[PDB]
Ligand binder design. Structure first.
Ligand SMILES: O=S(=O)(O)CCN1CCN(CCS(=O)(=O)O)CC1
Lengths: 173, 173
């Protein structure tokens, strides 16, 4: 059961503008079944980078792309959950990590990040709705304003309002 | 939980900068170290790797891994090193000579053949012949820095070798 290993985006599927891109689909019972097949990459004629479970039609849709790939866009739908393979979500930072979309959620000193959508312990104005494009989801380390310190988060320790996270640069010689 | 880690058998790490934090604890199994590192519970840093001492049943948790500047990868028969996949670069620089991630599927979805196996395909890309290149398991690798990036011998007898689909670090914003 590998489903917990993916980055989940609720109420979301992906559509390919480029008709060339390939998809595979199958009627299934549960989302973990899609996860298993993606992780194993069994019986797919491509590298699985993401999948969607359609809870209304009970289908898996496996993709050789994710939400950040060229030629694909997100689509809203209550019936869909998107699961993106973390092996295809860049896990290092470019520049100050404005564009970081990885799932690290602990600060440099080991403190669990507070969720962006929560005002507890720390009341703040970094609401996801104020920062579209910046992926202020769950409690992920992010740098929505492109500040010199790199990705950071509000902290679950009431005594520490915010702290930077310790995410490595992709390339710095 | 232990599967979220890349395992290097018979290996440990040693710091050269004595300001790097470490935490140790006598435990029962390596699985218990993985759990504590995943939960990041009671560690005053971001856990990026751990070593299990099988002879002492001790966990050593680290805020570094083998690619961190100033740590020494060392042989030791009683040690196994486990590195958190979130901290092993999952994109390629240049042609990907330095790629050390755990992707093991080709671009057309085929499971890689182990570098140690000669079945279905016989070859001279042995670990011993390529020290430092991490030709372990069936990981996509680029030991000679060839054009298409990391690749592998394929488990399909019809396809000797094929590149994998590891993204360039420059592919996304
Ligand atoms: O806490 S407040 O809501 O008042 C202000 C939010 N805030 C401004 C100061 N920084 C430093 C950037 S970084 O060093 O963390 O990258 C991010 C956190």
């Amino acid at each position: 059961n590998t489903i917990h290993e993916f980055k989940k985006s609720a109420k979301t599927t992906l559509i390919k503008i480029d008709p060339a891109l390939k998809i595979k689909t199958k009627k299934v019972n549960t989302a973990d079944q899609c996860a298993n097949r993606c992780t194993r990459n069994k019986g797919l004629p491509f590298t699985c980078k993401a999948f969607v479970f359609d809870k209304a039609r009970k289908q898996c849709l496996w993709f050789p792309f994710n939400s950040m790939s060229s030629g694909v866009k997100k689509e809203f739908g209550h019936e869909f959950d998107l699961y993106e393979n973390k092996d295809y979500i860049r896990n290092c930072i470019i520049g100050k990590g404005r564009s970081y979309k990885g799932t690290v959620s602990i600060t440099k000193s080991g403190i669990k990040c507070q969720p962006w959508s929560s005002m507890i312990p720390h009341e703040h104005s970094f609401l996801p709705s104020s920062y579209r494009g910046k992926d202020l989801q769950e409690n992920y380390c992010r740098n929505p304003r492109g500040e010199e310190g790199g990705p950071w988060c509000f902290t679950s320790n009431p005594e520490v309002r915010y702290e930077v996270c310790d995410i490595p640069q992709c390339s710095e010689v």
